[PDB]
Design a protein around this ligand. Sequence first.
Ligand SMILES: CCOP(=S)(OCC)Oc1ccc([N+](=O)[O-])cc1
Length: 117
Amino acid sequence: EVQLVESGGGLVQPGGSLRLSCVGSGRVRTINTAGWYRQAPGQEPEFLARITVGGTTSYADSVKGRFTISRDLAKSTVYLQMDYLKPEDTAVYYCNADFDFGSRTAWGQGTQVTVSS
Ligand SMILES: CCOP(=S)(OCC)Oc1ccc([N+](=O)[O-])cc1
């Protein structure tokens, strides 16, 4: 069993930046990949970025060149560095983790990001 807890987020101006954290607890060494997703108002959740234990990353086009995903294995924490922020980035941001040889999935609780002036 794996639990994910998110922190960071809140209100930021366009052009600002924020860092989100996704802290894993439990059997974290069984985690294979972790990803970030977001759910904008009125829309379904959308994939943003993924990272492997080895640190290989992959990104959706909507955030390529603006958001960065990273992980700290010792802290069992995956990060989303959200830069060059646009009003259209306003959403609830979720992290997930695939574990047990990619056969199970855990989700964080979500954190609101509001980009507004
Ligand atoms: C959401 C937390 O993910 P975290 S950093 O995984 C990112 C892919 O999980 C870990 C942590 C430590 C090890 N390890 O081998 O020591 C392996 C995986």
